[PDB]
Motif scaffolding. Sequence first.
Motif, mmCIF file in Angstrom:
data_model
loop_
_atom_site.group_PDB
_atom_site.id
_atom_site.type_symbol
_atom_site.label_atom_id
_atom_site.label_comp_id
_atom_site.label_asym_id
_atom_site.label_seq_id
_atom_site.Cartn_x
_atom_site.Cartn_y
_atom_site.Cartn_z
ATOM 1 N N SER A 7 -5.393 0.843 11.714
ATOM 2 C CA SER A 7 -4.885 -0.533 11.693
ATOM 3 C C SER A 7 -5.202 -1.237 10.375
ATOM 4 C CB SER A 7 -5.453 -1.338 12.869
ATOM 5 O OG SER A 7 -6.856 -1.437 12.757
ATOM 6 N N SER A 29 5.289 0.339 19.536
ATOM 7 C CA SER A 29 4.296 0.084 20.590
ATOM 8 C C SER A 29 3.550 1.371 20.944
ATOM 9 C CB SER A 29 4.968 -0.451 21.858
ATOM 10 O OG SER A 29 5.786 0.549 22.447
ATOM 11 N N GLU A 30 2.456 1.244 21.695
ATOM 12 C CA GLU A 30 1.732 2.418 22.193
ATOM 13 C C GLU A 30 2.621 3.255 23.126
ATOM 14 O OE1 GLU A 30 -2.192 1.396 23.694
ATOM 15 O OE2 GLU A 30 -2.594 3.467 24.320
ATOM 16 N N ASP A 57 0.141 1.551 15.157
ATOM 17 C CA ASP A 57 0.890 0.810 16.165
ATOM 18 C C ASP A 57 1.348 -0.515 15.549
ATOM 19 O OD1 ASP A 57 1.953 -0.519 18.369
ATOM 20 O OD2 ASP A 57 0.111 -0.471 19.539
ATOM 21 N N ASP A 60 0.946 -3.866 17.301
ATOM 22 C CA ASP A 60 -0.356 -4.529 17.275
ATOM 23 C C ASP A 60 -0.337 -5.556 16.150
ATOM 24 O OD1 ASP A 60 -3.163 -5.180 17.087
ATOM 25 O OD2 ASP A 60 -3.524 -3.405 15.877
ATOM 26 N N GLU A 62 -2.600 -7.019 14.560
ATOM 27 C CA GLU A 62 -3.565 -6.719 13.506
ATOM 28 C C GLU A 62 -3.146 -5.551 12.603
ATOM 29 O OE1 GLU A 62 -7.594 -6.482 15.048
ATOM 30 O OE2 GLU A 62 -7.699 -8.667 15.274
ATOM 31 N N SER A 63 -2.085 -4.832 12.994
ATOM 32 C CA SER A 63 -1.501 -3.723 12.205
ATOM 33 C C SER A 63 -0.174 -4.073 11.520
ATOM 34 C CB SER A 63 -1.259 -2.493 13.088
ATOM 35 O OG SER A 63 -2.449 -2.029 13.693
#
Length: 117
Positions: A7, A29-30, A57, A60, A62-63
């Motif tokens: 990330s 997404s995951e 991901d 996310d 934060e990513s």
Amino acid sequence: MLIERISDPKDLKKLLRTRNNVLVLYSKSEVAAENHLRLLSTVAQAVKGQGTICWVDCGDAESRKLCKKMKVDLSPKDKKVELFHYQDGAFHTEYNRAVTFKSIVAFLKDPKGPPLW
């Protein structure tokens, strides 16, 4: 082997500086990544010592910044993931062959020397 998730931009920067044959799965997404991760885990085992596979991901928050830095385009509705290949520390190509064990393993084992010109 386990496909590790990144990330933090500093971590991808370090990976690309220290490993010369890297495939990164960028996912919406995951859940979108699941099928690819299942296959890539087996590919990673088969290329141990020769290639490194990780995932990001992009779903996310934060990513998101890392995905933007790396020029990821997951805007199309029918595109769940992007597979980017980095050779000798820099982006080389988006993976564009069949998404199968034999194909990805052969791709990571194939020399990609200089362009003909």
